[PDB]
Design an enzyme around this catalytic site. Structure first.
Site, PDB file in Angstrom:
ATOM      1  N   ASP A 127     -15.668 -27.307  16.070  1.00 44.38           N
ATOM      2  CA  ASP A 127     -14.605 -26.644  17.020  1.00 44.38           C
ATOM      3  C   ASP A 127     -14.721 -27.153  18.731  1.00 44.38           C
ATOM      4  OD1 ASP A 127     -13.884 -24.499  19.286  1.00 44.38           O
ATOM      5  OD2 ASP A 127     -13.204 -23.594  17.204  1.00 44.38           O
ATOM      6  N   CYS A 162       1.784 -32.062  25.742  1.00 54.87           N
ATOM      7  CA  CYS A 162       2.738 -32.879  25.308  1.00 54.87           C
ATOM      8  C   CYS A 162       4.180 -32.075  25.596  1.00 54.87           C
ATOM      9  CB  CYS A 162       2.747 -33.277  23.909  1.00 54.87           C
ATOM     10  SG  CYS A 162       2.918 -31.644  22.881  1.00 54.87           S
TER      11      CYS A 162
END
Ligand SMILES: Nc1nc2c(ncn2[C@@H]2O[C@H](COP(=O)(O)OP(=O)(O)NP(=O)(O)O)[C@@H](O)[C@H]2O)c(=O)[nH]1
Ligand SMILES: [Mg+2]
Ligand SMILES: [Mg+2]
Ligand SMILES: [Mg+2]
Ligand SMILES: [Mg+2]
Ligand SMILES: [Mg+2]
Ligand SMILES: [Mg+2]
Ligand SMILES: [Mg+2]
Ligand SMILES: [Mg+2]
Ligand SMILES: [Mg+2]
Ligand SMILES: [Mg+2]
Ligand SMILES: [Mg+2]
Ligand SMILES: [Mg+2]
Ligand SMILES: [Mg+2]
Ligand SMILES: [Mg+2]
Ligand SMILES: [Mg+2]
Ligand SMILES: [Mg+2]
Ligand SMILES: [Mg+2]
Ligand SMILES: [Mg+2]
Ligand SMILES: [Mg+2]
EC number: 2.1.1.-
Lengths: 325, 154, 216
Positions: A178, A251
């Site tokens: 993680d 993005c």
RNA sequence: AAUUAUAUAACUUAUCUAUUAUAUAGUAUAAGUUUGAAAUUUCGGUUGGGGUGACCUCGGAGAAAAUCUCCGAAUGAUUAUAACCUAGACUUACAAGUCAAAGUAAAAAUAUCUUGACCCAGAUA
RNA sequence: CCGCCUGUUUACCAAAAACAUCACCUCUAGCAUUACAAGUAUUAGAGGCACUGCCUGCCCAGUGAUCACUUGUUCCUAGGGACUAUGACGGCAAACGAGGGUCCAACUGU
RNA sequence: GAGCUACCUAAAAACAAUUUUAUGAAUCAACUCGUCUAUGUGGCAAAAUAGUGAGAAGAUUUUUAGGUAGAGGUGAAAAGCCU
């Protein structure tokens, strides 16, 4: 019964149409038509061979032209031509990587310096991670991705593009854990921590059908993305050494997901951990790549390369954060 | 006068074999489903239709009917068939992605005002871009190239 | 807004749009259809407003049953599409008055416009109210319409005249001192209805039942 | 929905006649193609019941072996190219799946790391 | 409130707001010896729909002005020719009803 | 199997009195239908009785003989009717 792409297009229309005003038409045709690829040489074996052939195709390195050690070839303004597929070189290393020119800018804007340890909190396959290897100014590159499948891809990409000597046992290190947990694992360890959070991937979700963030079942995840992004950005900021630099890249164009995330992280880091992070001016960068990029100059924090049919390089949002202490 | 214009534009109506004449008409009536009177307008208004491969002609009608929402009467009244598919697909698709056009749903409703079909095709390219699409000329020229590749990669 | 002759009904949708923009939507922030809901007391044109907008924008036609007497629309119905460009739907609901009207006068006025069934008030303690306010407000139009002799302020007199004009009589049992007797008499009840039904139709003039309460 | 469809309609090539300079006509039939009046058959599973979704096989980790908590695979690259034969066993309803001495043969020991039956069609020798 | 109206129906639990209906509208057909029809587009068939009056969408190349350019459409190669003189929608009308709600009068062993 | 019923063909019938007019008009018999309530529920009746009702010169009702047949017929569509 709208499909996942239909919902993604439907959701974008109501929100983005207000954000940009009258540029949404332009920004809207670009996402549904096609993309423009920028080839990046492997700099290891064919550092000269690929460069000569690409120039004969009229493709020019935008990074090198702008300066007028990363070099990525792109076609001229408004040229729709493509790049021949990458091939295996004589030495056994691929000729070049084809990536969205925009993806390279974050890396180029990260201000890498020699003898700098670099962490990629969410190292997506290739992309920015591969480019960092291309630049020689690295000591111990690290890479992580919560999912294990993509990292499997990441190892193959490194293998085909990086000589074994460079990717020695400690030179590079791929751990599938993680990212938020990384805040504790290390602290004040890596000078540069490139953090590209999982995002809505506008261009992809529109075309993509499988595993689309806009699926109705995946609603749970979509709502919580801003929270997860803040945590991942916070983890990287803690890890960076005093005086270190990190770049937050995304993005999508959702202001809630690009500009507030960095400001949010700053406040949470400002209060809970009693640390101060100060943003760095990228306006000079803005003026340099005007010729081969289309960005709207109204971003309060960071920069945002909108797409455009003339250019189509995008969509990206790269913010640079310097830790003052 | 209907024959006069038809003969001038399409001299070979008399000279074409009965096969070609029948096939064109059969499509307009059996597949396109134009009323008897409308067909006569198609023959007289756009004589060139008689020289188009039946299957190619049918496609042109389908594209309008389904992917544009135009009614049978709209196609006939606007001389839609006289235009070329290449131009039709470029202009319509360009707007269909810019967000300036929308295909009526089941109910026949559209959430935006579709511009007049005359504006889509009748006006010049400069007129079409400046007013209907409010876009620069270059971007369109780039779009035309991209459009072709999609056809090739279709 | 006047529903019957589509007066000022265009303006409503832009205001609803602008009004919603200021507010938050939370759970429905992603839905593209703007659903709004219409409520009010009976016989205010609530069901008609559905149709007037149904046609003004969508140009489709009547969709909700419009009726004169109160109580036509009973239950909360499904959505009725009104517009396509903003994609606005309407929810129609039954008219509710109150568990307890405030004053005997407001309740008397609220029956004038036709909001509550007239037989709950009798139609005889209400016709009187018309003559009072009609004379008080100065609208001496019933005299000409009903060809009355001259202005008056007594129901027994005007309703006597109205009944004769309309040639309406009943056979009513009256109780005298020697026993019940059935005697033909003029319809005081029928005149009250017709007197009420003319007022409500607007042929007796325009009124401002709440006056001197609005100015202040 | 799947499979058909000399129902009607059309064309195309033959067949058989007329003619004609090769040619346009027709046509007790055959073979195609297009159209589809019809015909035949069916309505997987798990999910207080109804929308949608989903999930159904095998492998890895926890609960700790009954249902629950999590990750991955329908391979991937590397390569020394990894043969034939044959005791004894593992696993297992069946089916499929594992390990392997000895002997022989190549070479000069080694494959390292992390999955679908039968039928039926193929390909080369 | 609904349906224009007289009509029609689920023989044996539904007579109705459903169905038909004149009026209106769309589509198809240029023709004879067995239906349509011993007929011929003021005809016939298929189907929709209340009528009447009232309203407004589409559509109606553009600019000069019956004239020229710009367009449009085709070809021959970016050039050269060739050609181009009004509505699909609503809003409402009395009469009638073993229709469905409501009121008053009278009437009563409800 | 159309002696019931649906529709049709041919040949025949019936409609007083009263008011309108010159009629798919009115009141109301014969006649046709079956609205509402009660009785009945192995009942008089495998759909009736008693009241109350709708139409009643018409797209009316009735009689006789013929026609259309189950992959079908008929249908002022109730998926009605076809012993
Ligand atoms: N003069 C006039 N009458 C109107 C107007 N709007 C409605 N009406 C009348 O009011 C009646 C219709 O009421 P409606 O639209 O059904 O309203 P409602 O409040 O929804 N009815 P309800 O009482 O059942 O709640 C009709 O008599 C109609 O003519 C208006 O603007 N002007
Ligand atoms: Mg076994
Ligand atoms: Mg051995
Ligand atoms: Mg009726
Ligand atoms: Mg009747
Ligand atoms: Mg019955
Ligand atoms: Mg009957
Ligand atoms: Mg009845
Ligand atoms: Mg009955
Ligand atoms: Mg009906
Ligand atoms: Mg009735
Ligand atoms: Mg009483
Ligand atoms: Mg018989
Ligand atoms: Mg008589
Ligand atoms: Mg009569
Ligand atoms: Mg009667
Ligand atoms: Mg009668
Ligand atoms: Mg009948
Ligand atoms: Mg039905
Ligand atoms: Mg029987």
């Amino acid at each position: 019964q709208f499909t996942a792409s239909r919902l993604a297009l439907q959701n974008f229309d109501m929100t983005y149409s207000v954000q940009f005003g009258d540029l949404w038409p332009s920004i809207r045709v670009s996402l549904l038509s096609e993309q423009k690829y920028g080839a990046l040489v492997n700099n290891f074996a064919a550092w000269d061979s690929v460069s000569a052939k690409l120039e004969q195709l009229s493709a020019k390195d935008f990074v090198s032209e702008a300066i007028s050690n990363l070099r990525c070839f792109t076609f001229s303004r408004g040229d729709v031509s493509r790049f021949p597929p990458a091939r295996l070189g004589s030495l056994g290393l691929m000729d070049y990587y084809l990536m969205d020119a925009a993806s390279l800018l974050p890396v180029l804007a990260l201000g890498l310096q020699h003898g700098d340890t670099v962490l990629d909190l969410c190292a997506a396959p290739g992309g920015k991670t591969l480019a960092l290897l291309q630049t020689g100014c690295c000591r111990n590159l690290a890479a992580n991705d919560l999912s294990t499948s993509r990292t499997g891809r990441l190892q193959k990409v490194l293998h085909s593009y990086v000589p074994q000597d460079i990717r020695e046992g400690n030179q590079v290190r791929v751990t599938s854990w993680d990212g938020r947990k990384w805040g504790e694992l290390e602290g004040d360890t890596y000078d540069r921590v490139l953090v590209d959070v999982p995002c809505t991937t506008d261009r992809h979700s529109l075309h993509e059908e499988e595993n689309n963030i806009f699926q109705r079942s995946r609603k749970k995840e979509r709502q919580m993305l801003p929270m997860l992004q803040v945590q991942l950005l916070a983890a990287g900021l803690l890890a960076t050494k005093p005086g270190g630099h990190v770049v937050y890249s995304t993005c999508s164009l959702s202001h809630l997901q690009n500009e507030y995330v960095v400001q949010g992280a700053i406040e949470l880091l400002a209060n809970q951990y009693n640390i101060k992070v100060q943003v760095e001016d990228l306006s000079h960068f803005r003026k340099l790549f005007m010729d081969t990029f289309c960005f709207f100059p109204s971003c309060q924090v960071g920069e945002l390369v909108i797409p455009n049919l003339m250019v189509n390089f995008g969509p990206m949002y790269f913010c640079k954060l310097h830790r003052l202490p | 006068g209907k024959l006069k214009r038809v003969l001038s534009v399409c001299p070979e109506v008399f000279t074409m074999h009965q096969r070609d004449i029948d096939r064109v008409v059969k499509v307009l009536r059996e597949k396109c489903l134009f009323t008897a009177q409308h067909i006569t307008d198609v023959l007289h208004r756009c004589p060139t239709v008689l020289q188009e491969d039946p299957n190619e002609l049918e496609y042109k009608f389908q594209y309008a009917y389904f992917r544009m929402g135009l009614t049978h009467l709209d196609i006939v009244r606007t001389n839609f068939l006289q235009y070329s598919i290449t131009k039709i697909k470029q202009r319509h698709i360009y707007l269909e992605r810019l967000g300036r056009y929308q295909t009526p749903d089941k109910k026949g409703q559209t959430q935006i005002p579709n511009p007049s079909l005359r504006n889509i095709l009748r006006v010049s390219e400069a007129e079409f871009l400046a007013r209907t699409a409010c876009s620069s000329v270059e971007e369109f020229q780039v779009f035309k190239k991209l459009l072709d590749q999609e056809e090739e990669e279709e | 807004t006047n529903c019957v002759k589509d007066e000022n009904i265009k303006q409503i949708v832009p205001k609803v749009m602008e009004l919603i923009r200021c507010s938050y939507r939370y759970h429905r922030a992603e839905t593209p259809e703007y659903c709004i809901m219409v409520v009010g007391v009976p016989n205010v044109g609530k069901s008609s407003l559905i149709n007037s907008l149904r046609r003004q924008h969508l140009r489709t036609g009547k969709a909700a049953r419009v009726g004169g007497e109160p109580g036509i629309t009973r239950a909360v119905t499904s959505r009725i599409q009104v517009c396509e460009r903003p994609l606005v739907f309407l929810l129609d609901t039954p008219g509710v008055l109150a568990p307890r009207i405030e004053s005997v006068e407001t309740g008397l006025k609220l029956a004038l416009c036709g909001t509550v069934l007239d037989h709950l008030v009798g139609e005889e303690t209400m016709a009187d109210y018309l003559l009072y306010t009609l004379n008080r407000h100065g609208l001496f139009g019933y005299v000409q319409h009903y060809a009355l002799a001259s202005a008056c302020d007594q129901i027994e007199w005007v309703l006597k005249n109205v009944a004769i004009k309309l040639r309406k009589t009943r056979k009513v049992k009256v109780l005298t001192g020697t026993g019940n007797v059935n005697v033909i008499q003029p319809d005081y009840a029928m005149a009250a209805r017709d007197f009420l039904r003319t007022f409500r139709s607007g042929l007796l003039g325009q009124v401002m039942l709440d006056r001197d309460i609005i100015p202040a």
